[PDB]
Design a protein around this motif. Sequence first.
Motif, mmCIF file in Angstrom:
data_model
loop_
_atom_site.group_PDB
_atom_site.id
_atom_site.type_symbol
_atom_site.label_atom_id
_atom_site.label_comp_id
_atom_site.label_asym_id
_atom_site.label_seq_id
_atom_site.Cartn_x
_atom_site.Cartn_y
_atom_site.Cartn_z
ATOM 1 N N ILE A 27 1.102 -1.145 -0.003
ATOM 2 C CA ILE A 27 0.075 -0.056 0.196
ATOM 3 C C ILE A 27 0.877 1.412 -0.016
ATOM 4 O O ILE A 27 1.693 1.491 0.859
ATOM 5 N N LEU A 29 1.025 5.580 -0.226
ATOM 6 C CA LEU A 29 0.138 6.654 0.106
ATOM 7 C C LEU A 29 -0.063 7.763 -0.718
ATOM 8 O O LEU A 29 0.651 7.832 -1.489
ATOM 9 N N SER A 30 -1.260 8.431 -0.824
ATOM 10 C CA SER A 30 -1.434 9.636 -1.710
ATOM 11 C C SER A 30 -0.652 10.953 -1.058
ATOM 12 O O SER A 30 -0.831 11.113 0.057
ATOM 13 N N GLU A 31 -0.042 11.635 -2.202
ATOM 14 C CA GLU A 31 1.025 12.506 -1.895
ATOM 15 C C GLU A 31 0.092 13.829 -2.388
ATOM 16 O O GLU A 31 -0.042 14.045 -3.651
ATOM 17 N N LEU A 34 -13.940 13.220 2.319
ATOM 18 C CA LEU A 34 -13.424 12.536 3.534
ATOM 19 C C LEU A 34 -14.367 11.388 3.685
ATOM 20 O O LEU A 34 -15.347 11.111 3.062
ATOM 21 N N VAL A 35 -13.861 10.210 4.498
ATOM 22 C CA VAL A 35 -14.365 9.006 4.677
ATOM 23 C C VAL A 35 -14.977 9.061 6.263
ATOM 24 O O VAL A 35 -14.199 9.173 7.113
ATOM 25 N N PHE A 51 -1.942 -4.604 7.678
ATOM 26 C CA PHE A 51 -1.486 -3.287 7.458
ATOM 27 C C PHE A 51 -0.266 -2.789 7.774
ATOM 28 O O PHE A 51 0.353 -1.765 7.749
ATOM 29 N N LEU A 55 2.207 -1.096 5.076
ATOM 30 C CA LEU A 55 2.448 0.158 4.884
ATOM 31 C C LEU A 55 3.878 0.383 4.855
ATOM 32 O O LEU A 55 4.379 1.569 4.442
ATOM 33 N N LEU A 56 4.560 -0.128 5.718
ATOM 34 C CA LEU A 56 5.753 -0.059 5.690
ATOM 35 C C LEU A 56 6.656 -0.564 4.253
ATOM 36 O O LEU A 56 7.535 0.149 3.848
ATOM 37 N N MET A 59 6.596 1.720 1.771
ATOM 38 C CA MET A 59 7.520 2.979 1.746
ATOM 39 C C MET A 59 9.077 2.376 1.871
ATOM 40 O O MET A 59 9.985 3.216 1.713
ATOM 41 N N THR B 386 4.741 11.418 4.082
ATOM 42 C CA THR B 386 4.265 10.020 3.539
ATOM 43 C C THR B 386 5.248 8.794 4.018
ATOM 44 O O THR B 386 4.869 7.657 3.704
ATOM 45 N N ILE B 389 10.172 5.895 7.444
ATOM 46 C CA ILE B 389 11.335 5.253 7.766
ATOM 47 C C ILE B 389 12.466 6.232 7.424
ATOM 48 O O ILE B 389 13.492 6.452 8.028
ATOM 49 N N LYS B 418 -6.656 2.348 2.357
ATOM 50 C CA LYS B 418 -5.624 2.885 1.127
ATOM 51 C C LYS B 418 -4.529 3.737 2.031
ATOM 52 O O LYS B 418 -3.769 4.214 1.410
ATOM 53 N N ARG B 423 -12.182 10.931 8.425
ATOM 54 C CA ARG B 423 -12.862 11.981 9.057
ATOM 55 C C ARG B 423 -12.870 11.970 10.445
ATOM 56 O O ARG B 423 -12.460 13.080 11.271
#
Lengths: 73, 653
Positions: A27, A29-31, A34-35, A51, A55-56, A59, B386, B389, B418, B423
């Motif tokens: 996954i 991230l967007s750079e 709202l949810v 997750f 997420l790591l 990255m 974003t 690390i 994602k 919110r």
Amino acid sequence: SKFSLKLGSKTLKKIKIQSIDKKKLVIKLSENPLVEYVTEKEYNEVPVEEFGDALLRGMGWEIHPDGLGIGAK
Amino acid sequence: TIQEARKLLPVHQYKDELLQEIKKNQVLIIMGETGSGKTTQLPQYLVEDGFTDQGKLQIAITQPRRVAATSVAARVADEMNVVLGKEVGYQIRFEDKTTPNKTVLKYMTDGMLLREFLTDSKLSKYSCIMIDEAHERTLATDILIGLLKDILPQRPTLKLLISSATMNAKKFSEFFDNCPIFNVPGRRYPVDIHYTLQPEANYIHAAITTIFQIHTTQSLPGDILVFLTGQEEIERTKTKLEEIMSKLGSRTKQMIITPIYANLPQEQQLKIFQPTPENCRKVVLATNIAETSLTIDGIRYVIDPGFVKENSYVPSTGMTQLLTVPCSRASVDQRAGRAGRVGPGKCFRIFTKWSYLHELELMPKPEITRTNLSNTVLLLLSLGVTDLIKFPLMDKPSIPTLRKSLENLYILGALNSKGTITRLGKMMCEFPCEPEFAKVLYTAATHEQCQGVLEECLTIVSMLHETPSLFIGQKRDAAASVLSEVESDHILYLEIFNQWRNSKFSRSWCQDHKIQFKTMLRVRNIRNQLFRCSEKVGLVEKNDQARMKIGNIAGYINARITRCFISGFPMNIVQLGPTGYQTMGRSSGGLNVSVHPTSILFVNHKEKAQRPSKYVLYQQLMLTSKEFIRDCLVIPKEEWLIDMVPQIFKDLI
RNA sequence: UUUUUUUU
């Protein structure tokens, strides 16, 4: 002048192989609308254990005794 | 005068070189001793030079202690001869004393200036931020110098300054890519450092021995400050001293014992500040509160066994552990400096010079590698970071420490699958509490099975920040006099505050029921601030509908408060097993945890004989001598676990 | 059988 009869359609009516030879979730991230909630469906796709790794990977991860001195053998 | 006394301070003679050094560079590091005057005198010289000038921008001076931020701003009010609140301010968590246009230099604390990133990232109001006491290495300080490394390309006109201790200042310059280190070596009343020649067996006895070596023979007036580890080794030394003081003869002068630590009540902490009269000696026992926080007058002699007590968050099982360690060389030299406060003073260290060089360490522990990181990941992610690390931080958190904080935001619903902050997750940056606590307030308003109980959850959440320092002495003695039907350690907090409120906030009510009155003032201030921010988001308006439109005032209140604290704290639930209680996590197995002796679930399981409830919610899994559990909450029904958090408990049950 | 300091 012969014996002839007509037989029409209206009258009557495993894996194939050619030759024999010798996963992970990520996954980002967007750079830089709202949810309200995560929802039940989302957790089913990405589990809670998954997750933390994913997420790591997006990255780029890939007792002292009661009384002594500082010496006191 | 005061203008005559400012020239006496060490940093004043270095000033004329120092101004050209700041004007040429951008980041400058000051290596100064304690008492050099780099805190007080430095931002004054920029105002005298006209640094701010015509411009709107004002100077910010960042200090880690809230108490020190107010007390230093009183001194600058004296030296610049302006009343506090105008031209010299301070902005702390509760008492903003500033003028928005006439106050030039504001001495805010470290947690404040991170919050101003959350609205305005570039810091458009400031020309010169001075970090002070950067060797403290609080969690707010490491992120603040981590974020100000990124802001220096975006603003070339902002000045940054750092005051630091000597041994820590080398590591700062390499972080800012070799920015120059300035030096002010100002030291007052040097101390002679005495050692033991051979390692000792039991340091508590040698501490008691060395006090009498100072008491019976040495010159007077002299006071003694000893540094024990925690509360429990102060009372054992307080009791063993009271015997031997009486057994000694009537000729020796009177010795006074006055313990200090953080959780001891305010009425006894004022006893050190009273000047001791003639013909008697004051001996003070203390934890770490003496070395950095406050100043005791008359301390000549300091005995230092060389032990501190530190907490390391173990992020796999999610438990803090609090052990005794040998302290680093940085904290020893801070302990000796408390001797030379008035005159020349002795410092006695119960260890050898060989062990002091070769066994002890230089830097103790960076606090960001220790503590929990679930709050600051949400601070970083809302500031558009974003990549965590590769985030240019000084001392990296370990990857399991940083992994566990990313799952823990995903459970609460702050982060979308994602990776986007939702919110709900934007609100948790706003509230002045943890990301766990601000979901308890959010399901106290909106969630359909837990509505209407937000007026009580603000009461409990306010009490849980102050659970160490509530009760004078033992809890159950003060718990039983209030009421006798509590079965969980949370509902006692709702009941103690509600009965303190219907007594119209009396001082005399607290001393009846053995509750610290100073603490209950701080709980009231935390409650009012959480009530403002719940109006401003709009939770109060959706709260009040669900009480009028659905009337519920029966005994269903304490079953909705329980279901709010499951949605907030879903990893913290244990299960009753054969040995005892075991942790119910999928990654961390059962750790066989035991209820702490303070809690109400410990009275009801031993002094009475209530059958133990099958699930218990805790607030804090800490191990002093054994894996303990604090601030417990009985969950009676098993089906509250599946219905509130199905993203975990639909599997494990 | 009993919490080191702290910050929003």
